[PDB]
């Protein structure tokens, strides 16, 4: 039942509500030390786009509004830009931890 899981994933993505604020999935991650290091390694255009998206979301939440439905972040164009940087940061931190174990 792959398409049932996929359509349920689309439903959960629409029901989470951050697509109505223009946000991506990687903007909603909590900025811990690994996530902050992932933002620090970003290229500057992606960093500026992310900062504008957070500012727009905070401005929309201030007025208790949402974007119009055509401006919502669609599921197919939601790019997981922070995944390789976060993956590298987790790999390096686990390597440091396993070196500190021995």
């Amino acid at each position: 039942s792959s398409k049932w899981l996929d359509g349920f994933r689309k439903w959960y993505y629409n029901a989470a509500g951050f697509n109505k604020l223009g946000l991506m999935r990687d903007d909603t991650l909590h900025e811990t030390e690994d996530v902050k290091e992932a933002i620090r390694r970003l290229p500057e255009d992606l960093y500026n786009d992310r900062m504008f998206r957070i500012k727009r979301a905070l401005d929309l939440t201030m007025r208790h509004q949402i974007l119009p439905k055509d401006q919502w972040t669609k599921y197919e164009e939601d790019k997981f830009y922070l995944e390789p940087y976060l993956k590298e940061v987790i790999r390096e931190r686990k390597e440091r931890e396993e070196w500190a174990k021995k």
Binding site: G17, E44, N48, M51, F52, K55, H64, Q65
Partner: protein, 74 residues
């Protein structure tokens, strides 16, 4: 220490504001409030209300079961 001027690095963002003496305090209040109140209610009522509904049901059941317990058993 964490005052203005060094909170975050923001590039190429333009912000526009008016004086409060040029704009209304309540600009189109209910025409933009009742649709937004109904919209917020629509997004949150299915996650808020049914726990309180089943609390009301358990409360009424407990009250009627207490009254039936106090009643006679011929």
């Amino acid at each position: 220490g964490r005052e203005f001027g060094n909170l975050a690095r923001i590039r190429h963002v333009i912000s526009y504001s008016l004086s409060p003496f040029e704009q209304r305090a309540f600009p189109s209040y209910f025409s933009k409030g009742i649709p937004n109140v109904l919209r917020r209610t629509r997004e949150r009522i299915l996650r808020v209300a049914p726990p309180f509904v089943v609390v009301y049901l358990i409360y009424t059941w407990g009250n009627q079961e207490f009254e039936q317990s106090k009643r006679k058993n011929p």
